[PDB]
Amino acid sequence: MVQPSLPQDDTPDQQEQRNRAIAQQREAYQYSETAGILLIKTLPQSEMFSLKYLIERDKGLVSLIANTLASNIENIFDPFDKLEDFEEMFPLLPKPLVMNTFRNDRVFARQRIAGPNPMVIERVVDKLPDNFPVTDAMFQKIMFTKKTLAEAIAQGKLFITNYKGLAELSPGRYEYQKNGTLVQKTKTIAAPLVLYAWKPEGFGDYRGSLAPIAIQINQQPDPITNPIYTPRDGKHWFIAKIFAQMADGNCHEAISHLARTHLILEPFVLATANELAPNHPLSVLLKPHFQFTLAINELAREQVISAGGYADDLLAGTLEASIAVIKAAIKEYMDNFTEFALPRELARRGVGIGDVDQRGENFLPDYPYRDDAMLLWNAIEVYVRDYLSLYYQSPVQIRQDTELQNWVRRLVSPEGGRVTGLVSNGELNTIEALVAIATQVIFVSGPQHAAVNYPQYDYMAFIPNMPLATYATPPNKESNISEATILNILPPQKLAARQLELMRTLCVFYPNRLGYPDTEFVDVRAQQVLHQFQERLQEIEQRIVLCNEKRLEPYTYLLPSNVPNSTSI
Amino acid sequence: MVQPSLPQDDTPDQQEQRNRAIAQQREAYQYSETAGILLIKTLPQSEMFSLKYLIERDKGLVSLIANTLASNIENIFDPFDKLEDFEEMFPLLPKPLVMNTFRNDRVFARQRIAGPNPMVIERVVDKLPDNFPVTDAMFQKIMFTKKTLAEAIAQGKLFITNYKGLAELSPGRYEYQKNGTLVQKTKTIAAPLVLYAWKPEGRGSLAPIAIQINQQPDPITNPIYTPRDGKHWFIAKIFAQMADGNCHEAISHLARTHLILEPFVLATANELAPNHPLSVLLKPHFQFTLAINELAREQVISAGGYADDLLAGTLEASIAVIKAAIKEYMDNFTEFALPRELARRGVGIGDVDQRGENFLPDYPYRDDAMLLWNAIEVYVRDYLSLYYQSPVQIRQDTELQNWVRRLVSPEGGRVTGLVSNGELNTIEALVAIATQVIFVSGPQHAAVNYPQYDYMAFIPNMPLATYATPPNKESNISEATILNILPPQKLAARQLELMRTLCVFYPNRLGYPDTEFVDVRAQQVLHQFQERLQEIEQRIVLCNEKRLEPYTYLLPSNVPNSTSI
Ligand SMILES: [Fe+3]
Ligand SMILES: [Fe+3]
């Protein structure tokens, strides 16, 4: 229980102790890589999960044993017999909230702003992509209007999810034994473009809602082999949405979840261990938000991104392709770190709080993720500022903090995370910059990972709403579509069971709670700051309850009581 | 990396250092109790499972999800439709070794000497129990002989498993919804007596002679069944096995491996400095023990836990049996050393006839366990000799005396049979204590833990509970009668899940600690121990080539360094 202090304010003996501890930690937290991803070489036992954690996780897994025992699904690579079978997969589990309404277009579109991956939709500016040949005829026939695409774009009414990031995926393979021989099959890759429109009148009331307009399943347009489907296409439209959802799933797990929550946090935990003394104010601020992060990332290394792991069996591409996408997302995030602060990232997609019309209202008024996440971001920013100002009163202390300077230097180094977009002028020089960095790290570890992790069961544990891979080509636009066609597009029984398995263990419990660390701060000032953070969190909780009373569907994933303190599951 | 030293040989500064560490450890390893069982209050994070352990355990649980997915067993309290269904529960799991031959009487009897619970059989002396009215007529008709019971007992040919310990169990209950109504049913308990004989003719082997399912005899409602009884004999074995299962899990496994080790780990933390030689000797053999005992508290002996759902009695009754076993073990600690324990059941190495031959020549647990016991004894004698030159160092070791005092205290384990004269005074006494602790943590827990899948994951061979009364001796027995006696589908699935989880992997290996001894001499002691373990492995392989069935559970390769699963 030592009072935290900057290293340039300690006696030479105290400095010797700090360097001793830092050297020991460097011995314990050594840098390693798997397939070019920065991980820890050996997990320190003090960084393992707790007994409490293990008890909860075990409860989840045993619940999966029981639910499997009560289920009728079989251990086969055959498709299901009936679509209804997908709804009989939860005899002893909660029913995923999306199950009943997933066919509705508004429920399909709302997942762009309140589903597991609210990170893709962007407002169209100037024009649609030239490989997305949507015409005025299509837009008018779907919207039942005389307005043109150009006029709608001029009014900020059109939005788009472009999944070109998945275009270069190599399709995943799978094989099994049937009738004594080895059958080998290949998944189907899709990189769709989806045009949505904001409807202020909505679907028959005074609630404005997002409405899907068009879906091109792949990137290169062709009127016969890759047409533009619309809600007027019936079953084909349905199939189109499936593929779109599949795309959204992959981007969700590779980019939004694994890359930009779990894996980008790792170099920060490791840098904290390698450059900051135990009694350094920054380490004491951040370590509560790193609890179990190294451990859960080791579990991801062993069980998710490993050969035969979840990403291998479930995702669209081969394990190699998926890891390529993950690494590209990590690299883009690290190169432009400060640009991925929540306000700037929302603005860059044209759906920030400042993307308003002439009347002063947002082009996308219904965006629960944006609003709640903004509340959490501002609260965390105030908490971080008030905390760090207790130990940094003038920027010269920032510049003369040797441990903090080595922290930044380790982060931006090629072997320490390659975070080249972390600081300006090649150095950390101001207090506000550190405030922004810590705010973003804490926001990612808690709020962001909550928002991308916990909708996974409600939207991705019911397989037809968001299958992680599709298993048949998109039928020709003129072909007849039977139930067996859709059943062959959706995953076979074994892989659907694996997807449910994954989504259940990832959402089964909350390892900790935002703003409630295990050990309180030795500094009574800091503990007061923590308390006011908790009070503001209660205020935010009540405000979000109030918002949920008037929203179309409640958005519960960013309530402070549902947000972990760290990325830990 | 500090050289180990006795606490009275250190400088005053070093002494206050040891007292500091010991005080800190006392706050971290605080004593607690669940239902009168001594456990730890809060598990120190340093005592948690490692990441590797968690990876292996997760592989096991996922294997259970996959095996369940491929199975046709349902989540119902109905019995199975076919007996054959019990053999179809392992589509993606190893088939249990006992599955094919469990109906054979010799396979039934040989589990007393090489099954999961080789701790019950005892040689009959003088006479059978008076509540077990086996006659000369029965014995002669079974053995096809003219010899009497008295002559067989005089020759040491008769052995017995007396499950009187289960007689006072309150039967367990279970309830479930069926057509909008709550059905409530009760398990059937049994406390059988089983008479075996050593048949030298046959390789000689044990042969079951008689089974009385309950303790109080009655020719109508509790007769003495024999192999001549056909179906009824079969049922009489089921109940017997059920008994042997309960005694196995309550007494042999939970009580006398997992739970009796806990006070020793906690005493080591509460009274010994980190650089104390005894702590450095024992802590490798305590790895994950506190953690796995916490998992037992949460998942095994808890309401709705495994013991609640699977065992014969209520959770209260099972915990009563567990606590009685712990108390008898601690009260008579020295008497439960392997040679003495075998001698008290008349099946030790010294229980020989006039020819010098053992009355029970086929006892793989005894032979292999004796090898391991002697090896460990030499190991800890040569280890402790490096630090205890004369017994006055034993008497003047304050941390060790506080260790003993904590162990025998009523709130620290109540190990009243740990020490003579109320004090630890000699070196050899400590050698026997450490020998027994290390033997229990590794060899014993291996021998009772790892046959669990091969004999208890196939439910009909050893059901942890029976779900119908023994049929009348004259009534007809259909497949449905047996299926109603055996556990319903859901509880059979639960039993398989438990055994598989307990036998998936080996968390560590006997004689191979994670961190070496900082003392070079101690590393020589350990190296010698490892060489002896190699020799023992070869000897046991040789013996397994000559035995009827191999006995692999006490091979040094297969024995963990601690009780950790
Ligand atoms: Fe996660
Ligand atoms: Fe065990």
Residue numbers in the entry:
A (entry chain A): 1 to 569
B (entry chain B): 1 to 202, 207 to 569
Could you share sentences copied from the article?
Lipoxygenases (LOX) are key enzymes in the initial step of lipid-mediator biosynthesis. They catalyze a regio- and stereo specific dioxygenation of polyunsaturated fatty acids to yield fatty acid hydroperoxides, which can be further metabolized to a variety of signaling molecules with diverse biological functions. CspLOX2 is the LOX with the highest relative amount of bis-allylic product reported so far, hence it is a suitable candidate to study the molecular basis of the dioxygen positioning at the bis-allylic position. We demonstrate the importance of an active site clamp around the pentadiene system, which fixes the pentadiene during the reaction resulting in 11-HPODE formation.
A key residue that is located opposite of the iron ion and hence likely restricts the space in the kink region is the highly conserved Leu304. Exchange of this residue for a less bulky valine reduced the relative amount of 11-HPODE to 30% compared to 74% produced by CspLOX2 wt (wild type). In case of 13-HPODE, Leu304 and Leu502 are rather facing the side of 13S-HPODE formation, while Leu506 faces the side for 13R-HPODE formation. Consequently, if more space is created by decreasing the size of one amino acid, dioxygenation at the nearest position on the linoleic acid substrate is preferred over other possible dioxygenation sites. We found that the ability to produce 11-HPODE was diminished by widening the active site clamp in CspLOX2, while the production of 11-HPODE could be induced in its isoenzyme CspLOX1 by reducing the space in the channel.
